[PDB]
């Protein structure tokens, strides 16, 4: 087919988006928790913003990739809604993709994976609510 652009299909597109989200997670993986390690942020001019906060990193992290930008838009949803847990979100979502990508290699369709993750989140919220402690 002749077009004014470019196209690319297949399972490798899932892998390319998986390795991208996995890369963004590793940028904020070692900085998880109160003993997290600091990380440099070399801007375009030359300034170097050193910090360990995962939320501050993702606001300044600039990776020109669509899958990474989805997690950046995802960060704003968690920051505004609650204001914490953004680092665990990007790390949890990255492992679900790296594990789901392995299932896709075992001839497991993503629709069956999407259905499993939805039911797991429902039951997880149930088990969480059943094992709380009130204020």
């Amino acid at each position: 087919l002749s077009v004014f652009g470019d196209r690319s299909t297949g399972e490798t597109i899932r892998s390319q988006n998986v390795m991208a989200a996995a890369s963004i997670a590793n940028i904020v993986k070692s900085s998880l928790g109160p003993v997290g390690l600091d990380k440099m942020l070399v801007d375009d001019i030359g300034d170097v913003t050193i910090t360990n906060d995962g939320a501050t990193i993702l606001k300044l992290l600039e990776v020109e990739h669509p899958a990474a930008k989805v997690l950046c838009e995802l960060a704003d949803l968690q920051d505004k809604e609650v204001g914490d847990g953004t680092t665990s979100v990007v790390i949890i979502a990255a492992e679900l993709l790296k594990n789901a990508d392995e299932l896709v290699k075992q001839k497991i369709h993503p629709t069956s994976v999407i259905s499993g993750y939805r039911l797991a989140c429902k039951e997880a919220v149930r088990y969480i609510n059943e094992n709380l402690i009130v204020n």
């Binding site: 087919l1 002749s2 077009v3 004014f4 652009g5 993503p110 259905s115």
Partner: protein, 278 residues
């Protein structure tokens, strides 16, 4: 044979470009259709599964492939539904034509044969449909409400037919029986028309996590024994009686799809070559 002059290369050039547009838009069929990523030239990126929006944002340059794009617009104006199913049907018929042309069958014989399957096809769908009363505002409410539940907003031809690709299986099943009574090249040309319809439910079964073969293979027996009520139910994730699930579509969508798709396949088949003017 020598086959010095090779005008068939333009048929395979138009079929490949036509089949390419269908292969891309195939996965986005149904509620469980896999989304697709479109990136504008400026830098913006978007995600969607509506087949109509994807074809517009493809920038199709080939003439034969543009006929499928304009074909999808005709379905939107006439019926307004089944936009993605039309392009998938045309891509499979042309892919089936690639097997017939290798056997030494002419495009005109293939074109005239497909019209006979279309003529018998409309009779098959119209016979197994469910007539309704238009003045009865009860049927129109639940018909659009249940259909709108399949659309984005779920909270806020006087006939009907089942979904889940069941019209394509009854069409493919009885056309194979109709081809046994025919004579000449129309037999293989109509059988190939029947096998092409099976791409739709196998695509729905694939998107629903089921096996594409065993799903349509099981339904072809349920249609030989039962009726068109048997179709793929993605809400439950398996084969079920679609008449009970209240997942139906009007008759004009399935009829206009075969009508407009076959006319495009007949038009593409009649292309012997293209001339560049100035």
């Amino acid at each position: 044979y020598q086959d010095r002059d090779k005008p068939a290369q333009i048929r395979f050039s138009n079929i490949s470009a036509a089949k390419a547009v269908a292969d891309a838009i195939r996965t986005s069929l149904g509620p469980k259709g896999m989304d697709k990523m479109i990136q504008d030239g400026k830098g913006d990126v978007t995600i969607t599964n509506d087949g109509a929006t994807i074809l517009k944002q493809m920038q199709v340059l080939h003439p034969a492939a543009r006929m499928l794009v304009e074909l999808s617009k005709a379905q939107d104006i006439e019926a307004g539904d089944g936009t993605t199913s039309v392009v998938i049907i045309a891509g499979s018929l042309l892919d089936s034509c690639t097997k017939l042309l290798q056997k030494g069958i002419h495009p005109t014989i293939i074109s005239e044969s497909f019209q006979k399957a279309l003529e018998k096809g409309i009779e098959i769908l119209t016979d197994m449909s469910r007539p309704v009363e238009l003045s009865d505002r009860e049927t129109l409410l639940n018909s659009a409400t249940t259909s709108l539940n399949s659309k984005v907003v779920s909270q806020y031809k006087r006939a009907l037919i089942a979904g889940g690709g069941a019209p394509e299986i009854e069409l493919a099943l009885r056309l194979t029986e109709y081809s046994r009574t025919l004579s000449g090249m129309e037999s293989y040309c109509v059988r190939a028309f029947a096998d092409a319809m099976e791409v739709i439910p196998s695509t729905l079964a694939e998107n629903a996590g089921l096996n594409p073969i065993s799903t349509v293979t099981e339904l072809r027996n349920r249609h030989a024994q039962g009726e068109k009520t048997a179709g793929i139910n993605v809400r439950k994730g398996g084969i079920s009686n679609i008449l009970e699930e209240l997942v139906v579509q009007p008759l004009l969508v399935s009829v206009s799809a075969l009508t407009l798709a076959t006319e495009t396949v007949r038009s593409i088949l009649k292309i012997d070559d293209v001339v560049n003017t100035r």
